Amino acid sequence: HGQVDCSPGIWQLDCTHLEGKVILVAVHVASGYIEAEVIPAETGQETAYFLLKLAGRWPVKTVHTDNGSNFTSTTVKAACWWAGIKQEFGIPYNPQSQGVIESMNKELKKIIGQVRDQAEHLKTAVQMAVFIHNHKRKGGIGGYSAGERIVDIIATDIQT
Amino acid sequence: HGQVDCSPGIWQLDCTHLEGKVILVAVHVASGYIEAEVIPAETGQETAYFLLKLAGRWPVKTVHTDNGSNFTSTTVKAACWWAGIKQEFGIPYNPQSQGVIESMNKELKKIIGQVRDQAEHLKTAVQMAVFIHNHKRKGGIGGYSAGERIVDIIATDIQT
């Protein structure tokens, strides 16, 4: 659209679960474009590889989550480090403002039940799942897809 | 820049090697932005997961490579399939045109020797490696980075 949902370099990272294997959802808060790897293990070791990877691919000013324990490993601390990531959030006592946010952890988890049959494994499945999401365009005088907006924002050399 | 190097949805995918482990380089021919996973195994199974994944993330009209054997597995054939990927290339008998292309498989392989010490493993290393590349800006009246151009192209809703 333009002057978007939130800040250009903001993600929400949340290890998830399904069929004993932990799906891992990276989400572009402002554009809903998400990325997701299926780690067999919820370790700071793994969360880092992700961020790192994501950092090399997109401008990540800061990241947040629903469970902090996650961001408390050196492996991980060291990663947001060697890459310039910071955790984000805002409420401090200040002038009027407001809000509410969401979890695509569902949409994604929804389109999975669906496609699995088609999918050979969770892996192949979460990846089709997302593929389809990021691709899914909902009419809105910008009938673009999550995938289609994330670019633009960044694209326009979005601010901070 | 604008009217870029090649077509907006073009990649070059080439399984690589180093320290017994096969690095895997996805490269955005037109923008040099690259992605790379470290598969312990060079199997059509794995090449697909990659493409698939990459397809969910970027508009991939068609992909090429230096070794075709690679694109001859069902697992893989099935993947360029359920996702609309096609192999690409052009020479058929036609009007004057010309060219020459490259391999970032080197730059990447270069910045790795370097950083490893810093890196804990190839993995952590290829990922820093790339991070740094995509990030590396060379003066050019568009002193932008591989990472910075790939967006734009696509961004501008690039053609085909």
**B46 annotated ligand-binding residue:** no
Distances (CA, A) of A76 to A17, A62, A160, B130: 20, 13, 24, 19
Q: Is the dihedral of CA A6, A8, A12, A18 positive or negative?
A: positive
Tell me the Cα Rg of chain A: 16
Q: What does the alpha-carbon distance between residue B151 and residue B139 come to, in Å, rounded to a whole number?
A: 18
Return the residues preceding each gap in chain A, C–N over 2.5 A, or none: none
User: Pairing relation of β-strands A33-39 and A22-28?
Assistant: antiparallel
What's the CA angle centered on A138, arms A97 and A132, to 5 degrees?
110
Are A78 and A48 within 8 A, CB to CB? yes
- DSSP per-residue letters across A100-114: ----THHHHHHHHHH
Distance from CA of B92 to the nearest CA of A (A): 34
- Cα A119 to Cα B49, B76, B82, B132: the distances in Å are 11, 13, 10, 34
Q: What is the resolution of this structure in A?
A: 2.6
* Cα(B160)–Cα(B120) distance, integer angstroms: 41
Backbone angle region of A96, left / alpha / beta, with phi > 0 → left and psi within -120 to 50 → alpha: beta
What is the β-pairing status of strands A22-28 and A10-15?
Answer: antiparallel
Cα–Cα distances (Å) from B110 to A53, B81, B145, in that order, read 18, 34, 17
What domains does chain A contain, in order, with CATH numbers? 1-160 (3.30.420.10)
Q: Which residue of B has its CA nearest to A121?
A: B49
d(CA A55, CA A43): 18
Asked whether B61 and B86 are in contact (CB, 8 A), the reply is yes
Q: For residue B109, what are the contacts with CB-CB under 8 A and spacing of at least 6?
A: B16, B18, B23
Task: Say if CB A55 and CB A39 are below 8 A apart.
Answer: no
Whole-angstrom distance, CA of residue A84 vs CA of residue A42: 22
CA-based diameter of chain A, in Å?
52
Check if the beta carbon of residue A47 is closer than 8 Å to that of residue A15: yes
Q: Which of A35, A56, A124 sits opposite B57 (nearest CB)?
A: A35
> Any residues with CB less than 8 A from the CB of B63 and at least 6 apart, and which?
B10, B11, B12, B13, B51, B71, B80, B85, B86, B87, B88
Which residues of chain A have a CB within 8 Å of the CB of B118?
Answer: 82
Let me know how long chain B is: 160
